[PDB]
Design an enzyme around this catalytic site. Structure first.
Site, PDB file in Angstrom:
ATOM      1  N   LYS A  52       7.228   4.055   8.175  1.00  0.00           N
ATOM      2  CA  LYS A  52       7.415   5.304   8.169  1.00  0.00           C
ATOM      3  C   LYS A  52       6.850   6.106   9.269  1.00  0.00           C
ATOM      4  O   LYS A  52       5.470   6.121   9.429  1.00  0.00           O
ATOM      5  CB  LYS A  52       7.058   6.307   6.918  1.00  0.00           C
ATOM      6  CG  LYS A  52       7.883   7.403   6.728  1.00  0.00           C
ATOM      7  CD  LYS A  52       7.513   8.439   5.622  1.00  0.00           C
ATOM      8  CE  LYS A  52       8.211   7.911   4.229  1.00  0.00           C
ATOM      9  NZ  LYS A  52       8.195   9.041   3.147  1.00  0.00           N
TER      10      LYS A  52
HETATM   11  C1  LIG Z   1       9.117  10.073   2.609  1.00  0.00           C
HETATM   12  C2  LIG Z   1      10.506  10.137   3.610  1.00  0.00           C
HETATM   13  O1  LIG Z   1      11.288   9.248   3.057  1.00  0.00           O
HETATM   14  C3  LIG Z   1       8.805  10.735   1.581  1.00  0.00           C
HETATM   15  O2  LIG Z   1       7.727  10.351   0.918  1.00  0.00           O
HETATM   16  C4  LIG Z   1       8.814  12.378   2.050  1.00  0.00           C
HETATM   17  O3  LIG Z   1       7.342  12.507   2.606  1.00  0.00           O
HETATM   18  C5  LIG Z   1       8.566  13.107   0.646  1.00  0.00           C
HETATM   19  O4  LIG Z   1      10.056  12.971   0.049  1.00  0.00           O
HETATM   20  C6  LIG Z   1       8.381  14.768   1.346  1.00  0.00           C
HETATM   21  O5  LIG Z   1       8.469  15.394  -0.123  1.00  0.00           O
HETATM   22  P1  LIG Z   1       7.568  16.768  -0.467  1.00  0.00           P
HETATM   23  O6  LIG Z   1       8.249  17.892   0.407  1.00  0.00           O
HETATM   24  O7  LIG Z   1       7.653  17.140  -1.931  1.00  0.00           O
HETATM   25  O8  LIG Z   1       6.247  16.257   0.069  1.00  0.00           O
END
Ligand SMILES: *[C@@H](CO)[C@@H](O)[C@H](O)[C@H](O)COP(=O)(O)O
Ligand SMILES: *[C@@H](CO)[C@@H](O)[C@H](O)[C@H](O)COP(=O)(O)O
Ligand SMILES: *[C@@H](CO)[C@@H](O)[C@H](O)[C@H](O)COP(=O)(O)O
Ligand SMILES: *[C@@H](CO)[C@@H](O)[C@H](O)[C@H](O)COP(=O)(O)O
Ligand SMILES: *[C@@H](CO)[C@@H](O)[C@H](O)[C@H](O)COP(=O)(O)O
Ligand SMILES: *[C@@H](CO)[C@@H](O)[C@H](O)[C@H](O)COP(=O)(O)O
Ligand SMILES: *[C@@H](CO)[C@@H](O)[C@H](O)[C@H](O)COP(=O)(O)O
Ligand SMILES: *[C@@H](CO)[C@@H](O)[C@H](O)[C@H](O)COP(=O)(O)O
Lengths: 218, 223, 218, 218, 218, 218, 223, 218
Positions: free
Chosen positions: B86
Site C-alpha cells: 500500500k
Molecule cells: C487501505 C486502502 O485500501 C484502507 O485501510 C484505508 O486506509 C481505510 O479504508 C481508510 O478508512 P478510514 O477513513 O476509516 O481510515
C-alpha cells in the site's frame, strides 16, 4: 488516457518526465519563442525536447502554404521518429495532412474549434486532432461540449484519429476529458503538478505518520 | 465484487474468513497501531494476517521517499505472495508504483480523493486504487460519486487496475459500490456483519420454525 | 445577476467602473497585500476603493476570534455605508455574523466549499455567502456543482442570503452561474474584460463598416 | 411571440404588413445599403419604413464611439416614436445603451453571440437583445442553444429585456424560438412567407373544393 | 377538456347529444357533402345542427378569397350565436380571421399541420386552432407531437386561442390530447362511442349483478 | 390523502374508525352480499355503516337503466347526508351522474379502467371517480399508470372530481397513490392494518423500553 | 432547514447553542439513559435541557398504551412551552397524537421507516414526523430515498407536518436532506461539528494570515 | 424467464404441469405444513412433488446450524436429481451453501430482502437467490426495485447465480421481473392461472367463432 505536457520549457519537461506521468509533449510557435531568449535558438529547444521525451513530441510548421508545410514537415520528421508534425486546420493544412499521412509521417491538426473541423482532419488521415477547449471557454462557450461531440462522432465511425484535448486551463478540463474518454490531454505544467494533489491526501499522510510513531520511535 | 475486511484485528479477521465471505484484508498504520498494544509487535501482526488470509493483504509503507518506499515494499513482498504493498498518492508514491509494477510486486495506491488521482495511479501500473468515500462524506461531498466517475474512466480506457472502495462507513457505500461495479470494497468488521442481516430474514425464520413445529414437534427434517 | 470585481487593484477598479458593468468589488487579505507595496498602506487602498465604487465593497476581517472579528467589523462598517464585512466560515465567524446581522451590518461569509457550510452561513443571517469554485476545480471537483446545490437549497427555504460566486477563473464559471441563477459573481479583471467580447461581434462590426462606406464614403 | 421582418426592402415590408402578420421591422447597415441603389438614399428608405410600420422599427447607429452613438440615437429617435436604436455589443455600446435607457429611448443590442453578452446588454437596460443564431450555425455551433440559455437566464432574474432572435435562416429557427419562449423573432421575407404554407394545407383545400362542387356546382 | 363531435350526420349528433358528453360540433365541406344527398340541402343540415347543439358549432367557408370569406362568415354568424366560422390557414384566411375577430365573430382556423401555423392563427386572434393529427399520422409523422409543441408555445405566451385537436382517428389521440392538455378534441361518432367502453367495465357489471341476485332475487 | 375503508364488514369498519385513520367507506354489491348472511339484511348493513362513519359512505345502485339509477340514488341520498351514490361508467350511468349532480347528490363513478373514462365521469360532474388498479394488475397492465395519467389530466383542467383509487391490493398501491397525489385511496382492512407497521418500529420500541428499564425499575 | 442536536448531553447542547447553529434538541429514552449515570436523575436532565434550549425539545413517552401516553404527554407539556412530545408510530400512538393535537400540545411521531407511516402521522395532526434514515441504511436500503418520497407526498397535499430527518449518521444525510427540502435535521454532536469544517477553509485561512503578515507584522487590522 | 410454481399443493402442481407452463416448483416449511394435514406426512408430499415435476424442486432445510443444514441438504439432494436445497440467508447458511456448492449440490438462498444479501449468496456459490418482493411490498418498500438492483449487480460481475423472484403476489411482479430480466419467477397458483388470460383474448375468440359459423354452420 495519455497525458502530454503543453510547454517548451526544458525544466518543466525534464521535471514532469522524471515523475513518470508525462507521455509526450506538445509545442507551438508561441511556446517555443518564450524559451528562445537569452541566446537560445528555437532549433536547439526542439532538438533538446525530442531527446528528453520518449513519447510523441508535436512541433508546429510555420508555413501557411501547402508546399512549405510539407517541406517543413519532412524536415521535422527527420529530427526523430517520435516527432509529430502539427498543422493548422486550413485548406492547405488538410491537403498537407493527406499527403503526409501517405508518407507515414505522424500529424496533429491544431486550431480546431468545432466537431466538424475535427471530423475533416480525421478524414484527411491525421494522427491527432487538437480542439482548444480553453479558447472556447474564453468566448463564452463550454469547450468541453465540443470534446464530447467529437468523441461521439469518432466512436460512430470507428475513427482512429486520437482526440488530443488542448488549450487546457484547469484540472476539470482534465477530469471531464477522462470521463468523456478523450485519448489524450495536453496540460501546462502548473496544471500537471496539481493533478496529483489533494488536501485530504496530505491530511491522511500526516495522521498515518503519527500512528506509526506510536509503535516505532524511529 | 470482492469484499475485504478493513482491520488489523485478528479475531475479526479469523471470524470473517470463517464465514467464507472475506476475500482479503486491508490495513494501514493506524489500524495496525491499534492492535500493537501490550507487547504485540507490529511485525508479528502483519505476519499473522498474511498467514491466516488466503486472499490479498494490503500493508502500507511508512517511508515518504521513493527509495525508502521501494526498499520497504520489497520487504513486505518478501513476507508472502499474498502481500500487496500500500503506497500513498504522492509524487514519490507514483514513481515507486511504476518501479514495483515492473518488478511484479502487487501494489495498492491509497489516500485517493478524486478521479484523476485514481487515473494517475492506474497509469503508473497500480494493481488496486483505493478512493476514500467516507472521508469525502465527512467534508460534505458524496464520496460515492467519485467511485462512479472512476468506474466510467476505467471502463473508457479498459484499465485493469481494480477499484477498491475504502473508508467505508455504512452498508449503502457497499450497495452503491456494487451497483456502480467497483471491483472490491474493504469494510470494517461492524459493517461486514451488518451486510448479512435483515429484520425480515429473522422474522421469516421464526415463522418457518413455527410452521414446522405443527408438523414435527422436535423441529427436525426426517427424510 | 450582479457582477462584482474581485481585486484590490485601483486601476482595474477604475477601468471596470468606467465601463459601467461593475456592480461592486470583493477583496481579501492576499488581494490587498498584492497592492500594499512600496509605501502604499492597506488602509488607504481600502478607503480609495470605498470611495470609487458605489456598490458593495467586501473587506475581510483578519482576527480569528469572535471579539476581534466584531471589533474589526465595526471599524470596517464605519468606513462607508457600502462596506460589507467579509468573515470566514468558522465557529467564531458564525457567531460574529449573527451579532453583526442583529446590528444591521452587512456581512459576507467567505471560504465556503460545500453547500452545508453555505446553509450554516445563511442561518447565521449573512448577507452574502461566497463559495469558491476555482479552488474546488483545483482539487478535482467541479466547483459549479456546489453552486447548483446551494441555489436549490436556498430556493427550498426561500433563503434571502445572496449567493456570491467567488474564486472565478473563466467565463464559463460566469455563464454557468447565470444559468443556475446565482445572485452575484465576483470576477478578476482579465475575466471581466473578456465577458463583452466575441470574435463574431468584431467580424460583424467590420462587415457593417464596409456596407456603410458604400453609401457614405465619409 | 412577436414576428418582425428583417429587411429594408420596402416592397417586402408592404407585402408582409398587408398580411397582418408583421409586428415590426429590423434593419442593419448592410440591409439598407442593398436597397440604397439607383439614386435611392438611406435616409428616405428609413423614413419610409417608419411610416408604413405601426410597430417597432430597429435602425442601427453607424458611429463606433459613445458620443457619436448617443447623438445618432437621438436623431434616430426623433424620426418617430416607433423607432428603436440598434447598438452593437461593445463597451461604448453598453455605455450608450445605459444613457439612452435613462432618457427613455428604446434600444436593441445587436451582434450578440453568447448568453453572457446578452445578460450584459440587459444589465445596461436594453429594450431588446438580438442574438445571431444563423451566424453561430455558420461556424458549427447550434445557435438555438444560446437562445435557450438566454431564456433561462432572463427568467431567473425576471429580466424585462426582450429576446429578439436575429440572423434567422429557416422555419425551424422560428419553431424552436417559439418552443423556447423567445419574445421576438425577426425573419427574412422568404422565411416569413413559408411560415404560412404546408403541402397538406394545399391538398386539404383542393379536396374541400371538390366536395363543395358536388353539392353546389357553381 | 371539451369534447366536440366531428360529423355532419344528424342522427349521430342527436345520439351523442342525448348522452351528455358532447360539448359542440365541427363540420367541413366534405362532411356536409356526404349528407347532402337524396334531396337534402346543405343549408338545412347546418341550421338543424345549430338548433340541436347548444355549444359551439364550426361551419367552414367555401370562398378562397378574403372578401368572400368575410361575407360568408357573416352569413354563418347570423345563423345563430353558437356558430363558429371555420377558416383555412391561408394568407386570405388570416386576414379574414383578424377582421372577424375585431367584429367579435368567433373563428376556428383549420388545415393546420405544424405549430408555427397554429401560432400565426393565434396571432390573428382566432378563437380556436385545429391541427389535423390523423392526416399527419397518414404521412408518417406522429401528429400528436405537433399538439404537444402547440401546447408549450401557447403556454409560453399565455395565448387564449383554444387548441382543438381535429382529424382524430382513435381513442389514443384522445388520451394523448388530454394528457398534453389540449383545450378541445373533436371526434367522429365511432370514436366517441368507444370512449365510454372497456371490457373490464362490462365484466364488473356482470359480477355485481350476480352478487345482487344472491341477496335480492327481485 | 384521504383513506377510506373498502368493506361492508361492520367489525372492520368499527375497528378502523376507532383507530382515527379511516375517513370514509366504500361498498359494492359483492361486499355487501358477503355480509348479508345469517339473516342480516342488506338494508340494515348499509344503515349501520352510515351511522358508524362520519365521512363519505359510497353505496352502489343496482339498476342498470337511467331512471332506476336516479330513483335508487335519491333513496340512497335520503339515508343520510354522508351517503355517496356509486354509479358504473356506462351511458346511462353518465346521464344519471349529470342529473344527480344538478340535484346536489354526491356521486362516485365506479368500474373505471382508463383515464378517458375517468375524464368523462368528471365532465358529467361526478364527485369521485374510482379506477380499479388491482383489476388492471390482474390482466397484466400496471394499474398505477392509469392513476398517474388521471392525476395529470385532472391537474391540466383544474378538475374538482376527486381521484379515489380502488381495487387496492397492497401497500405499494397506497404508496404510489400518495406519491402521484391521488385524493383518496380505499383499502381492504388487511391492507389498512399493515400501513402502520414496520419491523424496525417494533425493534426500536423494544430497544427504547430496555433503556428505560435501566433508569426506571417500574 | 432547521438543525436540532440529537443528544441528551448538556455540555454538547450548551456548546452547540453557543455556536448559534442549534435550533432545538431531540432526545429519546436511550439518549437520556446514557446521561443518567452516577446520580443524575432523568427528570433533572429533561428539565435542564428545556431550560437552556430556546427551541423545541422533543421528549419521548415511555408508556405504550394510549392512556399512559396522553397522561405522560400532558406532564411533559407542563414542563415548559418548548417541550414537544415524542410518540412512536403505533396504533395507540396515532390515537394519542390526535387527542394531543386537539389539546394544542406539539407532537413528534418517531420510529418511522417508510413514507406511508409518515403520512398517517401527518393525518393524525402531528407537528413533526421523524423518519430514521441511518437505521434504513443499516438494513441495506438508502434511507434518504424515503425522505424524498415523504417530501413529495407532503408537497402534494400541502401538509403542514414538518419532516424531521433523524437517525443521521454523516454529513451527506444532512446535505441530501437540505437538497430535498426536509424541514429539520436532528444530528449527533460529532456530525454537527463536522458540518462547519472543510480542509480548504483551514488552508485558505492560513494563506490569508501569511499574506497579512507581509503588510502587518502584528497581524492586526488597523482602520 | 423460467416460471416456477410456489406451492406444496399437489393438485395445483399437477394442474400447472399439465398446462405445460410450469418449469419447476418452490416450497417452504409453511407451504408444506399447509398440506401435511389429516394424516398426510411431509416426507410423502416432498417425494410426490419430486416425482411429478421434471424441473427443479426447491425444498428448505429446517435446522439453523451449519452441520444440521448440510446433513439435511444431503438427504434432500438424495431424494432426486431435480431437488434443490433451499437455505436461509444466515451466517451458517452461507457456510452451508459454500460446502454444498463444492459438493455440486444445487442450492437456493432464501429470505433475501436487499441486493447485498443477494450478492453475498452469489459469492458463496449458490445456484439460485430468492429475494422476497411481496414481503417488501408489505412493509412499504417497492420490492421490485430490489430485483432491478440485483440484476444490475449480477450483470456487472457476470454472476452465474440465477435471480429467482419469490414472494410474488400479482401479475405485475411477473411482468416487471421479465422486463428487468430476472432468470426465474416462482408464483402461487392463482397468479399462474391468470397469466394466460385477457378479456380481449376471450372477446376476440367469440368474434372469430361468429365469423366461422357464417361460412360453416357446423
Ligand atoms: C487501505 C486502502 O485500501 C484502507 O485501510 C484505508 O486506509 C481505510 O479504508 C481508510 O478508512 P478510514 O477513513 O476509516 O481510515
Ligand atoms: C498544440 C496542439 O495540441 C498545443 O501546443 C496548443 O497550441 C496549446 O494547447 C494551445 O493552448 P493555449 O490556448 O493556452 O495557447
Ligand atoms: C472574497 C469573497 O467574495 C473574494 O476576494 C475571494 O476570496 C476570492 O474570489 C477568492 O479567489 P482565489 O481562489 O482566486 O483567491
Ligand atoms: C438586427 C438585429 O435585430 C438584424 O437586422 C440583424 O442584423 C440581422 O438579423 C442579421 O442577419 P444576418 O446574419 O443574415 O446578417
Ligand atoms: C374541422 C376543424 O375543426 C374538422 O371537421 C376537420 O376538417 C376534420 O376533423 C378533419 O378530419 P379528416 O382528416 O378525417 O378529414
Ligand atoms: C367502490 C368504488 O370505490 C369499491 O367498493 C370498489 O368496488 C372496490 O374497491 C373494487 O375492488 P375489487 O377489485 O377488489 O372488487
Ligand atoms: C428522535 C426523533 O426526532 C431522535 O432522538 C431519534 O430517536 C434518533 O435520531 C434516532 O437515531 P439512532 O438511530 O442513532 O438512535
Ligand atoms: C421459496 C424461495 O423461492 C419460496 O417458497 C418462498 O419462501 C415464497 O415465495 C415466499 O412467499 P410468501 O412471502 O408469500 O411466503
Amino acid at each position: 488516457m495519455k497525458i502530454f505536457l503543453d510547454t517548451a520549457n526544458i525544466d518543466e519537461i525534464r521535471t514532469g518526465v522524471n515523475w513518470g506521468i508525462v507521455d509526450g509533449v506538445t509545442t507551438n510557435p508561441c511556446l517555443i519563442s518564450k524559451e528562445a531568449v537569452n541566446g537560445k535558438k528555437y532549433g536547439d529547444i526542439i532538438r533538446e525536447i525530442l531527446k528528453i521525451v520518449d513519447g510523441p513530441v508535436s512541433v508546429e510548421v510555420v508555413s501557411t502554404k501547402y508546399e512549405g508545410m510539407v517541406e517543413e514537415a519532412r524536415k521535422i520528421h527527420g529530427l526523430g521518429d517520435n516527432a509529430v508534425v502539427k498543422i493548422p486546420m486550413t485548406e492547405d493544412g488538410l491537403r498537407a495532412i493527406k499527403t503526409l499521412s501517405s508518407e507515414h509521417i505522424n500529424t496533429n491538426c491544431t486550431l480546431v474549434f468545432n466537431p466538424i473541423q475535427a471530423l475533416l482532419a480525421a478524414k484527411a488521415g491525421v494522427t491527432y486532432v487538437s480542439p482548444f477547449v480553453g479558447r472556447l471557454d474564453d468566448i463564452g462557450e463550454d469547450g468541453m461540449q465540443i470534446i464530447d461531440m467529437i468523441r461521439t462522432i469518432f466512436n460512430n465511425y470507428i475513427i482512429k484519429t486520437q482526440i488530443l484535448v488542448a488549450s487546457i486551463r484547469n484540472p476539470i478540463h482534465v477530469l471531464r476529458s477522462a470521463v468523456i474518454g478523450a485519448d489524450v490531454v495536453t496540460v501546462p505544467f502548473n496544471v500537471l503538478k496539481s493533478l496529483m494533489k489533494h488536501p485530504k491526501t496530505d491530511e491522511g499522510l500526516a495522521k498515518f505518520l503519527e500512528c506509526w510513531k506510536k509503535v516505532s520511535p524511529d
